[PDB]
Amino acid sequence: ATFAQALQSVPETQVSILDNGLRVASEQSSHATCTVGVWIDAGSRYETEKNNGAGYFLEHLAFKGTKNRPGNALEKEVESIGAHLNAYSTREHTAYLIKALSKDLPKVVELLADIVQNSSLEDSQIEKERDVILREMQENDASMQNVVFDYLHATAFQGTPLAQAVEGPSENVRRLSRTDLTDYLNRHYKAPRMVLAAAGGVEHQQLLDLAQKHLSSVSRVYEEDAVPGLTPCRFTGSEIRHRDDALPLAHVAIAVEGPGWANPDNVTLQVANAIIGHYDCTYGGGVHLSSPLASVAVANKLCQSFQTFNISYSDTGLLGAHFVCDAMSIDDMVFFLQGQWMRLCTSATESEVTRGKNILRNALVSHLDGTTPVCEDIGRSLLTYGRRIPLAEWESRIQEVDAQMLRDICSKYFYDQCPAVAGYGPIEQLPDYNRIRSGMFWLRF
């Protein structure tokens, strides 16, 4: 069967709006289970540096008891049915999701009603969550990848609320109080900025009725008439390096500014990442991998690993690479990476563009398997693009690219640009800004 009607037979996401502006989206499948979640676009971009650890510590406190269900009641109600409860918070989103069976759908929508609306906070609970979140920051300090991405976010978005981390600093955690969490939850948890998403064996009318029963109490009116607007952040080409020579391996991330969510060009840039790919020391391909950077990394024994990333935020983003390697290769590997980027400016052919198109097709269909990633895609699509883009539209956008437009978008976004460099480990051979900036343009043209 041809891929087009294979994509067409996937059911469409159904989206409805309540009276308060709350968005309700559901996707039906043949599965016996379901995943129901709440997505609120309230992250560290909206925190004004007096509440830098508000969202992370609030989602720490969200499952420790509500108003009607104190302490062990909600966890006993959600664990007696075998449901799994998860939450996370990015720099622009905040998600509370539950995986459960299809029978217990009124129970799960009632629980997601009373978690995000009637959360109860207490002094012993807030102090024990304070020492828990301090120990969690202490144990997350030793993972080098999160440190390098936090350094890159700090040095790429200086003077803007996109630099500050999701967890926040230790001083703001030590100085946070009940009233800051209360009014942050009051001004940031509003119905027009809320999506209730569901994926799996779900009836849309039943969940719409239950959402009208439970989620129709939001107090969406501006209490202080303070509209939180999205200030456009500026990408600053800079370089942060954390030299510490007792670490065994060095992590270096190099990233230029991305277009954003609304620009379709990142889709083309996605194909560019599918040209460059990724490599680990545990890959079974060996030497004959199609990516030239991976082949020269295994052929010359350069890296422990490298990975190409494209993070997108509202009107901005970071597109680049991250590699962990020993010290004595770092400079050399940087050169190879830059050469590959400039190949995407000039020597893009039909073969690697077609291979990147096929890899991106397999990535965007294979990721949306199971209820949880489909529900995640639904929530992030209704929060970022404002609608759920169908996968046939993704295929139509993927098929439209060729080597000419891929190489001119790569010349638009990589050629003669100022990158952002973050490093951690034995990074003495990591070059200055001048060598990297000179290497991000060829002299032959």
């Binding site: 037979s9 499952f63 062990n72 049915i81 799994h84 998860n86 097709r361 294979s366």
Partner: protein
Amino acid sequence: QPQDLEFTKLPNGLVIASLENYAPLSRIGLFVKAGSRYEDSNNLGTSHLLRLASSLTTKGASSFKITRGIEAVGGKLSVTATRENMAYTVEGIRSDIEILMEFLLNVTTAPEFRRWEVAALRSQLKIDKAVAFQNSQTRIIENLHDVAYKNALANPLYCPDYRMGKITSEELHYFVQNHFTSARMALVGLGVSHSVLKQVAEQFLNMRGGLGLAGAKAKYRGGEIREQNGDNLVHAAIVAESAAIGNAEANAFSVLQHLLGAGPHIKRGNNTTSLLSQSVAKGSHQPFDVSAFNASYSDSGLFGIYTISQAAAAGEVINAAYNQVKAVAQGNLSSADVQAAKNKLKAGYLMSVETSEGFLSEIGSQALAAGSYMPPSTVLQQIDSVADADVVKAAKKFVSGKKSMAASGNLGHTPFLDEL
């Protein structure tokens, strides 16, 4: 479209199963009953090198041809290995997947196994064993399996230290020619018609010895191994023999495992419904994690307690968990708690088949285990057909049985088997 998983038993024992998902992506799996449990003391670590040597040169496609073709079409090739069986999975879009299958079949049918390729790949064996041993739970459970079984299940998944540098291609050829027989394979497919599976199944797989080697029946040993590596946390796994797969008491052991705690349900939760976690939380005042470890195999099984705790507080955690299981053993439980454990087990089983990877994994496991596809509703009513008397019997079997302990960390205060 969700109508049926069509099932076929070829007369040479070759199991075929396929479903017409009408999916955008087609997945083809080949499940071979030739895991690490079928070695002996002479060719240890051959399964690990065979798992790594799946991507080598075959008779029909070179390794360059295999890697460049699979990466050019965008498909995914993976080898999943456990103690019982191995599985080869390939994933692609619906059009090209046909040629992808012959790539997959070459990996199973005619490996060339050149000497210089495995000579280069032994370093890959070393680095992959180091990455797998970066976690400590792998080392605990492999030392535990080395303790518990006399033979045929004490062989580790990964290569021993002495074996690296002495595995030749003759051992791999012997392993394939006497373990990859046609009556020990299940070819399963999602998003593909059954006639194509029939064509591939008779056109590549129809020349084999037929049965291969039998095994060594997995005799139980018991005992304890304690190692001193000076970590900040102490791991301790204390198990005993349980019911094997296919028994009526394996479901009782699964219900007992979910009753005593089988993983969290809430991120940053307290796990109050688990009895072991609440008993240790009543006991200690330090970070910990206690769960129940179960493992069902062809002729034997293991069930016990896994505890990770502090250095000086390991004895109190171990003793509190053991007294909780002992208090369970003479029947101190409620039917509502058993119902909650049954609901947790049913929810976890239904969540295990959400993705196509787990669905194909359990379909291949059932096709290699009993040779018959069993629908999930019958599995759910089999789960509900256990009583709390069987859970009490399983707890008493664990309490009165001979023990097998694997321990690591600062063991200055960790107890022994006679101290429990």
